[PDB]
Each structure stands twice: as C-alpha cells, then as structure tokens.
Design a protein around this ligand. Structure first.
Ligand SMILES: Cc1cc(CCCOc2c(C)cc(-c3noc(C(F)(F)F)n3)cc2C)on1
Ligand SMILES: Cc1cc(CCCOc2c(C)cc(-c3noc(C(F)(F)F)n3)cc2C)on1
Lengths: 243, 40, 297, 297, 243, 40, 40, 40
C-alpha cells in the first residue's frame, strides 16, 4: 500500500485547525442565498463605527448619566473638566465600546484612534475647549500649560456640533498588548485630557449646566492579532432552560 | 480550500475575502460627506 | 467596497491654515461616523503599513472550534425491580446558547449563514464506590445519532430507534480520535438568526414564548454507549465543539454586557456591583478628573 | 557577502622574501580580526576541500527540538470538607529560560526571529499509596489551552474558561503520538530579545524589575486532564519541546560562563572552584609552561 | 480509501525531524520584517572572530590576570616563556573562546586555526619571540632547538603590535573529535610554545615586566559536525522565578 | 520546504541560505584592510 | 466516484442521475392528455 | 496491478489473462475432429 508514517500531531484535536470533514447530510441542498443588507466581512469594519464612552464612570452616576459629561460655566480659567483613561484591557470608559468589546477579543493592537465629542447644550450657549492626547512616559497633565505641549485640538462650539481628536499611533513597537499591567510599556497609550480654552457662556434664558457625549472609533490604519476568549463574559455552570 | 469529499459545504475554511465596505455602517447617508467640508 | 489585505498607509502632511476647510469638525447628528483623517488633524510622516487584516475576517473571528454542549450520564445497570429501561444515553435538543463565549461571539451579529464542523470528545471516570479497584478505561463504542424535528426519540440504550437507517449517526470509540463531521447550513431561511423579535406560534397564549424562532427547532442529538452495561459504574462525559465554516454575517449588534441566565431568552439579573451591573457596566473611579492607573515618579 | 556551501580551498604557495609585505603582522587595535591566510604564513599545497557547512547554519544550530517546560501535578480528587476546586491542571507563564541548554544556545544572540514548533509529551505514574494494585495507565484526554495576555485563566479543572471558543486549545490522549503545532513569530517587535538593558514599566519603583522586556509577556499555557478524577491518585508529568523554524539571528553575544540561578534575570553565584568560578572560568594548571596532558614515552 | 501501511518510525517524536505542523493562530499576520545590523547566517562566522585565551590559567591569577601573559627581560637566552594546550574539549586556554564555546556544541571539527598575540609593553620596549606549533606524535618541546624544527613565526615588536601564527590543518583524518581522551590520535592537535628569540629590552624609564594577550580564531577552511549538548552548562533542577 | 497547511509560517525548516559575510564581525573597519599590507 | 479497488462495484455512491420521467406513473395513458383540454 | 515495492513479485494479483485453449484437454488428437463429421 501507500507507505505511511504517523507524525507527532496525529490523533490530536486542535480547535484552530483548517481541514475538510465528512458531510453528515450527503447531497443536501442548502436554502438559496438571499441578499440581506449590512453584510460584515471584517471585524475592522465594526471598530471603525463610533460608540459612546463612560467618561462619567463614577459611584454617583446611574445608567444613562454615565455616558454624558456635565460641562458648566466656570468662575475660574484654564481648569481641567474631565479625563479619559486609554486602558482598553482595564475597566475604563473605552471598555464598553465597539472598539473595546471587539478589540478585547484580541491580545495585540496597532493603529490611530478617533474620539468625537458632541456638545449638547443650547444653540445660544458658546464655548472653547482644548482636548489633548499626551503620549506616555510620565504623569497625566493637570495644568493646561503642560497639556497644550502634547497632541491637541481647540474646540469652538457652533453649527458643527462635534469635534474629532485623532489619537495618533505613537509607539516604539509595531503593536501594543491588552495587558492587565496598565503601567507596562507594551500596554500604555498615554492620556486624553479636556481643559477650558476660554469658558462656557450661556444667556439667562439657557441652562448653565450643559452636557458633552464622547464617542471613540478606530481609523483605517487599525489592526488586531492573537484572538482570545473575552473577559467581558463569564460562566459558573451550563446555562439551564429556565433556571 | 482543498475538499476530499463530494459536497462543496464539507470543504475547509473558505478562501480569504478581503473586501471591506465600512461606509455601510460609518457613512450610511443619502448625500455623501466630502472630506474637509462642513457637513451640516 | 474596496479590497483591504493590509491596513491603510499614512501620507506625509504639511501645515494647513485654509478658510472654509474644517476637517476636525463633524456633525454626529447625521448618523455618520467622523471622516477626519490623521493626515488632516495633525502633521504626519509617510508610513508604509504592512500589518495584515486576515485575523479580523469574520471567517477567522467566528471560524474557531468552540464548546456548545457538555452532558454527563452514569454508564451502569439502571434496571430495578420493574424498569427494563437501561438509560445509558442523553438527549440534548440542539442549540448554541448553553456556553456564553460562543453565544456572545455569535450574538455580535443578527444573521449568520455558515456550515458547521462538529467534534465530539468523550471521557470516562470510574465512579468512586465503597469497594472500587481501578485498572483502566474500557474502549467503549459510542453512537451519536442526530434525531431531526418530528422523528421518534430513543427512550432507552436498547431501543430500536438507534437503527439509524435514515437518521444520520456516527459510531466512534473512546481510544480513537474525537468524532468529526460537517453539518451544512440547514435553516428553512437564508440565514440563522441570533435574535427573534416575535413568536414561533400562531396562537396568542402564554405557552407561546417570546424570542423563540420557528427556524431554531433543529431537532436533537441522541448519544448512547453501544456497549451493554459493565459490572461497575462508569461516568461518560461528552463535549461537543462547533466550528462555523463558509460564514456570511449581517447587521452587527451591540455586544452583551449583563451575564446570561438561560437559553430560552436574553433576560438578565446583572451583577450586584460594577462591572457589568444593571446601572454600572464599567467599574467606578473617584472622579471624571481622576486617573486610576496614573504613572507616579 | 558571498555563498559558502563548502569550506575555503587551499592554494599552493611558494617561498616569499619580499620587502614591505608582512602578512603575518596585524594591528588588533583597529578591532579587525587577523586577515593572515595559511597560503601567506607557511608554504601550502593545493587542497580541494569538499567539507559542507549546512550543519553550522543558524537554522540547523537553533532549529532542533529542545525541552522548555517540565510540570507535574497529581491527578486525583482534590475536593475536601469545603473546597469544590478539583486542581487537576497547571499554568506555566510561557518563557524559554527554565532549561539552560536551550537558554544558553538562544542567549548566544541578542535578537532572534523564528516561528516555533511545539511538541507536548505527557506521562503517567500510579502514586505509590499504602494499598495500591497497579494494572495499567488510563488513556486520559488532555487539553493544552494557550491563554494570551489579559485573558481569564482557569482556577479549576471544572472551570468554564476551558470553553476555548477563541483561545487556541489542543485535545490529545496519553496513548496517542505527542501533540504538535507551530506558533508563529508573535512578538510586538520585529525580533525576540534574549536580553533587555532596561525596564518594562513607566514607574521608577522597586516592583519595576530590571531585565524584564515588555515583549516577553507572552501569556500562559494552561494544561488540564479533561477526564474527571479516577478512584486512585495518578501523577501526570508534561514535557513541552520547542523547535525554532525560519530563524533570523542578530548581534552574536559572549557565551554564558556562570551557572544560571533564575528565569527573571541573568544573575550568578558561580561554582566554589574552577571551572566556571567567578574568578576562574578555565580549570587551573601548575604553570604557564606546564602541559597537563603532555604525551610521555 | 488511499491504501496505507504504518511503517517503523510511525507514532515516534524525533527531536531532529523536519516536518510542517498545524498552525495554532490561523491567518495570523506576523510583525513586518525590519533591518537589524549584525545578522548571523552561520556559526562559522562567529568562530572566525578573535577571542582571548586564558594562557595564564594558574592557581595564583584571578579574573583579568588570567587573560594576559607576563613577559619580562631574561638574565638567560633561548628560554621557554609560556605553553598553550590545544585540547578544546578539555579545560584549557581555548575552552572559553568563541571557537571553543561554539565548536564545543559539535563533536567533529576540521580546518586551520589562527592565534594572534598582542604585545602590550612600552613603545620604547623591544624584543623578538618565536611562537612554534608542534604537530602531535611526541612530547611538548622545552628547548628552542627542538621547537624551531616545527611550524613557527619569529615576532619582532614594533608599530604592528600583533603577530598571527596559523596552526595549519595537519591530520591523517578529514576531521578530529572533541574527545575526553586528550592523548587520542582522533583528538590531539599538538602543541603551541613561545620562546625568546633574542630578549625583552626596556630602558630604565619603562617597566621591565610587560604583558602579552593571546587571541584565537578559525580560518575560512574551518568546519564543525555532529551537534551535541555543550558540557559548558549544567542543571540540577528547573530554574525557579526567584530561588 | 513542502508545507501541507494554509499559513506559510507552518512550513518545515527553510531552504538552506549559505550566504556568509563574516566581515561584519571580522573586519568592521571604515577603511578596508589590504592582505599583506601594513595595517597601521 | 473515485474507487481505489480493481472491481467497479467496489466504487463509492454513483454520479448523481437527475433524469426524471414521472409520466410513467402520473400519465401512463395511450393517448396523451393535453393541458387545459377536456380529458374525457 | 499497482505495486508500491521495488521487486515485481511483491505486486498484487496479475492483470486478468482471459486466454483459453481447452483443445489441449478436450481435443488433443493428431488429426483434428471436424464438427458434424463421422470421427472414426
Ligand atoms: C442557531 C444555529 C444552530 C446551528 C447548527 C448547529 C449544529 O447542530 C448539530 C450539532 C451540534 C451536532 C450534530 C451531530 N453530531 O453528530 C451527529 C451525527 F452523529 F448524527 F452525525 N450529528 C448535528 C447538528 C445539526 O447553527 N446555528
Ligand atoms: C522569548 C520567546 C518566546 C517565544 C515563543 C514560545 C512559544 O510559546 C508557546 C508555547 C511554548 C506553547 C504554546 C502552546 N502549546 O499548546 C498550545 C495550544 F494548545 F493552545 F494550542 N499553545 C503556545 C506558545 C505561544 O519565542 N521566543
């Protein structure tokens, strides 16, 4: 017969193997293909869709309160309004996003991120903000003089209600890791901080306490590798029919 | 793909389709948004 | 629709102070995601990115072999005073919801069309009795029989429904490699649905449950020990693994946040406190101005 | 850069008494190795050397299968009064330093880029109890699951992290050939580094250890006995072998002299006396004029 | 089906086998290749790099003292200064060299060796040495009259600070063995000996006790075969995380 | 090389590359040393 | 069909014959029935 | 016949030889018998 030697890896079941197998229903005619809209070919298409961030992930906000940032008229100048941790692997504003949830199914990632902020005050309310992305190395900035020295965008409120800040791919390595150690060189992305450029100015007829909604997506230069079981979902037993 | 069996559905993982159209989800607007333009 | 084998390249950008051009401003109200490029938000260099995208294909993302069933029965003489029923088998009622990793990953889309490779992994243990001397696991023949919707199910190990003259069945032993076969795309519709906003019956009664799809009635898997009962009690544990092949996916969904509670519906209780609590998905930090993992020097 | 399939040939040389030509003299201070040929140092004959060089290729030198992990756990019922934890598994935390032969051989270069073939070799022994009658080794199913960085690890044999819906896992039995697979070049950088002159954290704290590389965080291998506990105690010993493939190597290093002491750093204690002592690598001889193995007639 | 017969060698794991295996990460994109200087293609490139010899491997020299040979002005003539055993397999000056350490990963070797000596005295210090390679057969020479009859080079100190002696490939067999028996015909290379040709002459202002550093490398006619685990490194237990 | 699998990294030991440039390590000097010449 | 054996009857399931003539059983009448016609 | 081995005698059952000459045993007579003829 055909001369044969069973190698190491014979009789093994690998969950990532790519082989044809015996058809259980021989000559079975599957249902004809029908056009359905919104066909997804790549997970990289979904991470490019904007998703809201829990910037207000505090132990006083409940439900929809956590997805909006209360911006007010300040009796001060240059003050920090809010921060955004960029630790996708750790419990932070980016975790429960399309970027977060789907990237969290992978171990390595590379590429530039976009973060869009929609102002939701009054048409009569004006203001200028400065959102800054600080690359990693040291502490998160608390003064505008320090934050302005990093990648930033100055935001003028008006007819265009939203601003994008591109968090550009700035790393020594081709990829970063979704690691449990946030302070690791392999994992750390740096900081996003928002300061008052001028102030929020609202006339008497308009509310003084407005809101900002933050969205985050990936750009076309975005990549994920080394698939893994997501830590988002857990299981203590086989799920029953009822309970 | 290879397939040692009669049926086509018995074949291994299908040949990589690298087609992407994220506009379906990212810009699903009747009038297309022009880059740099005020999109009002 | 364009081909993307590698991620987008970066083009060198210059200083730009031009009136009427505001690429960093967008209108989120249109429903359209920001179209701002890095090239037009900051000053960029030329980068030729050779990062591949093949690992983020839905074929690769869903086309791994995942556990979909774990059932364990006692392999022994179940006969009593008057039973005459051997009961050395189980029936599953096919589904893809019992295990959360494959469920949450499949539930990221509304519709899926895939042919599925199945792998059955059996395992034996001697039952720890009062007087039990171990010396090795019998090479038992197992029979996994797919009983389609409306076919007679087996009531015993010794039943004649196991004939399988037309029912698809696979015979495989313990010391052999795990049994494998490909089930085709077998829906009455053009895709599988992970969610059904409706009912599967024509009646309006309570008994007609919300969320049940009249295309998820996929029949049952009946698995038996073909060998008659041993003189001692064994515990057979069967693990069934599912690998989607030739996958088409539609209408991407918001990912599951709350832990699953059952396979009949998508209801939730949530966890007592954050993370993944009904009122707090992401864990708490002190303030909106607090960095919890702030690098201190 | 020239092709060398066979070692250099020797050319016939004549007597040479020429002024201004001193091929035997070199300047070591330039950093350049002596360029003196045998042809120009002595009178040589024509030799056509057909000795092959393929065995000294870095592909051949590093591309042998070497042991990288040996872990042994007890396969039994670990349950007690109140535990409910079966503990019939181990977690390794992937590395290539635990065994010195592969470590010292890899540590001869600064940077390596290779795809790695892994082979897992399991072995069972009956535990020598007070009353133990041997009669043969059960054909147990094992599961080796690669848990990448930042994924949930299993806490028990019966945990649901073993789902492996997206985690790479291999199922293989005792009486089968040893499990095998190829892991690709999986560094965040363009090569693996055997040495890191730096720290892997942004903080300056003691907890941030010197020598740890922020590209050697490779995740964990979790291996379990899939079979539930036997009535008797078994000891499973797992041996993992690594074969580098498609190897590129850079910046050759000074070979390790002192015996390794740990896998976190390259520290040493040295041996009490020569050889490989901190003050004496080569063994002692009586004098610089003494031949220790002098041929006497 | 395909007619099949499992041969002897079926179900075996050979640590030197060359077969393709199942990819664990299907369609995984490895990091793009980047140019790094000092790429090694062959171990024969490293053995061609000079490395210092412990010529002074004596139980009175410690550390860096062992890599230099104390050469002095002699109140005598024709005297032997130092010897070099050429037993790479045995504990000798050549063991802890690039030649030694990497050749010691093999069992068979063939080819000519180069040994370069750097004089490290004063610019004002002069001297003539004779280094001789005696092929094997009898005892190591102790008189210059006997040593001069073998392969040798006379060394005049000057602007060129170093001399090379080519230890030429002189053996009956195509290969020699790295054998534990030094006195074996398969293993023995012979002897290297250094005598005073004239003397070391230093003026009062300069030190009388100078030093010589010996380096050894392989030439382009050098070969190694039959790879083995090096005896340089040992292990009594699995190396722990701490201790 | 042969490779029965889809990925190229799954292939066996790569086809022997006999390229050698020991000058990288043996003569890494700006001005090349000429054989027989006084190299000062 | 493939067949690794000498005999032709040892071969696998025969190549699908999709020929149908239900008229054998559905209209086995000497004079053919015309569609739409009164068939008396 | 196929044969996976070096020697020709190791091959499977030889290709069917349908040659028949029963006359060797049924009519082994010097002068051939003519059909219908008195064979005396
Ligand atoms: C929702 C949804 C459901 C499905 C299909 C799941 C496949 O279901 C199975 C499984 C898991 C196993 C078998 C099976 N295992 O063994 C056998 C055999 F022995 F009968 F062949 N059949 C058959 C089907 C249809 O895809 N999406
Ligand atoms: C430094 C350094 C580290 C490395 C890579 C080592 C490979 O690490 C492994 C090992 C040893 C085994 C597995 C493994 N064994 O089994 C499995 C599976 F079952 F999950 F598939 N994975 C996976 C990796 C990444 O290369 N250089």
């Amino acid at each position: 017969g055909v001369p044969t030697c069973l190698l190491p890896g014979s009789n093994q079941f690998l969950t990532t193997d790519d082989h044809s197998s015996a058809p259980a229903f021989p000559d079975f005619s599957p249902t004809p293909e029908m056009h359905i809209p919104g066909q997804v070919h790549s997970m990289l298409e979904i991470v490019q869709i904007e998703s809201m961030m829990e910037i207000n992930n505090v132990n006083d906000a409940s439900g929809v309160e956590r997805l909006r940032v209360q911006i007010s008229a300040q009796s001060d100048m240059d003050q920090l309004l809010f921060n955004i941790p960029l630790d996708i692997q750790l419990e932070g504003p980016l975790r429960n996003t399309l970027l977060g949830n789907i990237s969290r199914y992978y171990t390595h990632w590379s590429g530039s991120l976009e973060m869009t902020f929609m102002f939701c005050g009054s048409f009569m309310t004006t203001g200028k903000l400065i959102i800054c992305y600080t690359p990693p190395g040291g502490s998160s900035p608390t003064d505008r003089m320090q934050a302005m020295l990093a990648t930033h965008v100055v935001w003028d409120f008006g007819l265009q209600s939203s601003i994008t800040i591109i968090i550009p791919w700035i790393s020594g390595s081709h990829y970063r890791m979704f690691n449990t150690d946030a302070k690791a060189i392999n994992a750390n992305v740096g900081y996003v901080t928002c300061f008052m450029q001028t102030n929020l100015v609202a006339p008497v007829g308009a509310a003084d306490q407005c809101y900002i909604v933050g969205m985050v997506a990936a750009k076309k230069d975005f990549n994920l590798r080394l698939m893994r079981d997501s830590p988002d979902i857990g299981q203590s037993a086989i799920l029953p029919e009822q309970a | 793909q290879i397939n040692f069996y009669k049926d086509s559905y018995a074949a291994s993982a299908s040949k990589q389709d690298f087609s992407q159209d994220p506009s379906k989800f990212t810009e699903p607007v009747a009038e297309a948004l022009k880059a740099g333009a005020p999109v009002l | 629709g364009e081909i993307v084998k590698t991620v987008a390249n970066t083009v060198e950008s210059e200083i730009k102070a031009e009136l009427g051009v505001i690429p960093s401003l967008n209108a989120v109200e249109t429903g359209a995601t920001s179209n701002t490029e890095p090239e037009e938000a900051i000053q960029t260099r030329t980068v030729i990115n050779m990062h591949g995208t093949a690992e983020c294909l839905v074929e690769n993302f869903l086309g791994r072999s995942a556990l979909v069933c774990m059932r364990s029965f006692e392999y022994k003489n179940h006969s009593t005073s008057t039973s005459s029923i051997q009961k050395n088998f189980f029936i599953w009622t096919l589904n893809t919801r019992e295990l959360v990793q494959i469920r949450r990953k499949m539930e990221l889309f509304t519709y899926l069309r895939f042919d599925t490779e199945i792998t059955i992994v059996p395992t034996l243990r001697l039952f720890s009795s009062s007087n039990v001397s171990f010396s090795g696991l019998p090479n038992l023949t197992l029979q996994a029989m797919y009983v389609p919707t409306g076919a007679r199910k087996p009531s015993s190990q010794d039943s004649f429904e196991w004939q399988s003259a037309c029912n698809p069945s696979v015979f495989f032993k313990i010391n052999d490699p795990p049994a494998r076969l490909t089930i085709p795309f077998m829906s009455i519709n053009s895709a599988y649905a992970n969610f059904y906003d409706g009912f599967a019956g024509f009646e309006k009664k309570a008994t007609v449950l919300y969320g049940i799809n009249p295309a998820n009635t996929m029949g049952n898997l009946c698995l038996r020990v073909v060998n008659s009962y041993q003189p001692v009690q064994y515990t057979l544990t069967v693990r069934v693994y599912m690998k989607p092949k030739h996958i088409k996916a539609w209408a991407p969904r918001a990912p599951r946040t709350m832990p699953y509670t059952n396979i009949l519906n998508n209801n939730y209780a949530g966890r007592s406190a954050a993370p993944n609590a009904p009122t707090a998905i992401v864990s708490h930090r002190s303030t909106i101005k607090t960095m919890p993992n702030d690098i201190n020097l």
